[PDB]
Each structure stands twice: as structure tokens, then as C-alpha cells.
Assembly symmetry: C3
Homo-oligomer: 192 residues x 3
């Protein structure tokens, strides 16, 4: 209920992400973060391969302050990657907690990234570039810390989103697979 | 699906080190031959596992298109399997990990580096001696490694173990043959 | 197997089993072979025969001090054959009461009692349990969280709460017990209210 894109009351559009290699220090990071600013900690999650993952939510000013305090003690270095999206896309909020496998769905891209921050930053950039739909997403858990997601829509939009992800990911991208029209035994449920 | 419709005795198994590359291989395998895609599942250690089912000619043709895409870049195929006529016991152990509750004896436990090594050796072992497949865990939860257990007569399970040895080659991590399990362990080997 | 096997105190009529023995093996098949030698050698109660993350096998057993010690000897003999598959090993003659309910499944606390807290992070499961038991019988602390290998690639962690002096006193003991097996040891003097009780979610 705290992952809702729309609150019933204060509005929290900003999304702060912290990916750490130490679970212990990862908790230390969370303390200092919520100390300097009243952000809303979305999750404190020990994940696959032993990494720790922090997600926070709040106003732009609140999140920004918590992230600065987080970085300073993160090297006092166990900080793997960071992400701050002042205005996260609405389709992205429901793909933060549990690994979502799509039920039923044309064209699709499959983005394979090295870190969790790379995935969330890539899906977001693509969701606000072309009218595409985020179908699946898995973050670190069960897949050795790696991350992947899928984006569906018209062919041209899928291609457009492919170049967007390819740019802001950089060396964090492992492979991007673009299929114009998958088989009927793939259309709908890509993972089973 | 994972049972034992036209008879589809052939089993194709693909271990791809990339989940993105994996879903591309699955699309290429089906567009060149009408196999039944049993599995498209990301497993532990960030690997991707593909399992297909069809006639020997269907699978054979699908795996050709698979190996073309799997090595298209700079390599992404960890291991592969192609069993024209897989044993009947081997089918209900492919979907999810199976733990035996109790036995009906000796036992052999095989630890393999890849999943393709496990299913291949289990297939070979089953066809050489009256052994019963009991447990099997593939990649998930154990960093990509795979294992299984076989039971039966002492001389029989040791005849099956020698077959596992050869079919695995360097993919064999460990083989254990317990002639007479302790009574508190007969059945539930994992708890 | 009786679900009450992890209970710190068995009912009246059941034998006393205060000792604890833990085995970490790099091989799962070898792990089964080792467990076989354990129960055959001595009548110890096998707590778990469990494969976990990083592909290692996890074994725990309980019984009288003389029994578990006898099973552990036969364990090390088999686990070390050829090239030893044994990664680490623990033997506690009288494991602390609080320690028992954390062995089986991962446990996350949902509340505290009024304030400091330490978070220990080890490389092996044995290093975690051994570090927890020593602290609990050194300082008046309370074990809140613990996770053994599963979901974190073989690593392990636990949390201890209490007064700042108590968690400090239970810090350098963990360091001496862990040795090189310790990764990171965090300490928090005054945790924020939002983190009090619920550290993992």
C-alpha cells in the first residue's frame, strides 16, 4: 500500500534508490538517511548474492536530503549504485517490491542490467519517452543480483525505448533483446 | 506438458548465461520448428533455463536455430542437452524441485555443475538398471548447480553410478553411494 | 521429524539435548555422506539436512555433549577425505536458549523494548552462530534478527539490541570469535523511530 502511485494523503513523487554490498552498513545508511530528512523508507531488503537494497519515497527536497546523507557515510565504501528519480513514472511504482510476471498481453524489449538501479533508471527513462507498457520486472532476487524487465507496445516505440535504455545504462547493460513479434507460446507469458 | 496429443519423446534443454539472450533463443527455436516450450525460467546464479518438447526431428531442428543465436554474440550457451527418447520417470522432475517423503535399499546422490549434466546422467542411469528417481533440484537455490538421488538394489545403483560417471565427464562434482542409509535418513534426505 | 526439535527446552520425558553441532560443506552429496556417519557413530538428533545458497550443504545436530562430540569427530573424518569439502564447523556444548529459535528459518523482529543495536555480518553460517552464542553469554543483549546463507549467497547476519555499553561489550567479543570470518560490523547508538523494531521489510 506504500508503493501506490497515487496516495488516498501527502504526495511522494520522488524515488530514492540505494544499492549496497554490506547488509550491516546498509542498515547504517538507512539510519542517517531518515535522520536528516523525513523520507518514507519503502524497503530494507537483503538480496541475492548478499547485496542490500534501499528504496525511499517522499518529496523532491526530502528525498534529495536523505540521499546526500546516505552517500557520505556510504564511503566513511560499500555503495554499489544509486538512483534518484524526482518524478518517477506511474507504471514504475507497482514494479518495485515483488518480482512481477505478466499474465497476458505485440512487440517487446528485454533489458538485462547488472545492477538494480540500472534497471529502474532504464525503465523510467523509456516509459516517459515512448508510449510503451512495463509488463515484467525482477530485481536481484534469485538472479545473482542482476536485473531485467520487459517493455511492450508498437514496434517503433519499442525500438525508440531500446536506444534510450542503451544510453543511460551504459556499461551497466548486459544485453538488450528486441523482438518485433514473438510466437504465440511467448506472447503473454514470457516467463514460466 | 511435463507429462510422459502427438507423442513427443524428445527433450531439449538449454542453459543460457543471459536471460535476455535466453528469450531470443526460445523465439528462434519455435519459428523454425513447432516444439512444445516446456520452460522459460530464470534460475539462480543469473542463468536462464530453456526446456522444449517435441518429436526427435522437431527438437533437433529447434536446437540448430538455438545454437546459432546462443553463440551469435561472444557466446552465451553454458551447456546443452538433446535426448531423443527420455525415460518416463524423468518428466515429473523437470518443473519444480522434488523431495521424497519416504521410500518403498541403497541410494546414490549425484552433484553436477550444470543442469544439462544432471538430467543427462539421470536419463542414462535410469536406462541401465532398475533404479528409482527420488529427488532432484535444478539450479534454483543452489547457485546454478544441480543434484538428484537414485535408489534400488546395491549392485544396481552401483551399475547406474558408473554410467553417471561417464556421461557427466568433467561436469561431475561429486558422487556418493550409501549402501545402507541410517533409518532416520531413509526417505527424507532433505529437511 | 518432530517440529519441536528446535525448541530450547523439550517437554518432560524427552532426553536433554543442550549441545549443538553445525557443519558447512562445499558439497551437498558429501553432506549426505557425512550426516550418515554422524547418526551411525552416535545417537544425535539431526536438526536439518539442508542445501542453501552458494551451493553449500548445511548440517545441524543436537544431543548430549558426549554424543554430538562423537558425531562431529566422524563428521570431520569423512568431510575431509581426499580434498576436504568442509568449509567451517561449530561445536557448542551448551548453546544459549535464545539462539535456538533462529536456526531453522530466517527471523525478522517486528518490535523492540526501550536502545542501541549492532548488526554483525559473517562469511560462514558457523561464524554467525558462534558469534551470537558468545555475545549472549557475555552481555545482557537480545537477538532480534538472523539469516543463515539462504537468499544472501552463503553469507550470514544477525542483530543484537540492548544498552550501548552492552552492545559495545558484545562487539569486541564477536570480533575475537569471528576472526577473519567477520566482514562488516555496524553499530548504531540511537536508531531512528522508523527503524526501531522493523529493520527488514
Amino acid at each position: 500500500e506504500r508503493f501506490d502511485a497515487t496516495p488516498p494523503e501527502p504526495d511522494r513523487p520522488a524515488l530514492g534508490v540505494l544499492e549496497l554490498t554490506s547488509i550491516a552498513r546498509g542498515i547504517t545508511v538507512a539510519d542517517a538517511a531518515l535522520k536528516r530528512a523525513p523520507s518514507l523508507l519503502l524497503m530494507s531488503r537483503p538480496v541475492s548474492s548478499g547485496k542490500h537494497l534501499l528504496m525511499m519515497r517522499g518529496q523532491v527536497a526530502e528525498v534529495e536530503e536523505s540521499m546526500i546523507a546516505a552517500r557520505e557515510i556510504a564511503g566513511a565504501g560499500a555503495l554499489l549504485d544509486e538512483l534518484e528519480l524526482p518524478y518517477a513514472h506511474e507504471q514504475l511504482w507497482r514494479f518495485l517490491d515483488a518480482p512481477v510476471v505478466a499474465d497476458a498481453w505485440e512487440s517487446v524489449i528485454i533489458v538485462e542490467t547488472a545492477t538494480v538501479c540500472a534497471a529502474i533508471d532504464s525503465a523510467d527513462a523509456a516509459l516517459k519517452t515512448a508510449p510503451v507498457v512495463l509488463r515484467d520486472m525482477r530485481l536481484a532476487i534469485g538472479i545473482a543480483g542482476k536485473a531485467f524487465f520487459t517493455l511492450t507496445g508498437e514496434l517503433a516505440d519499442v525500438e525508440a525505448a531500446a536506444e534510450v535504455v542503451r544510453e543511460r545504462c551504459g556499461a551497466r547493460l548486459l544485453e538488450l533483446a528486441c523482438i518485433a513479434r514473438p510466437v504465440d507460446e511467448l506472447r503473454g507469458r514470457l516467463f514460466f
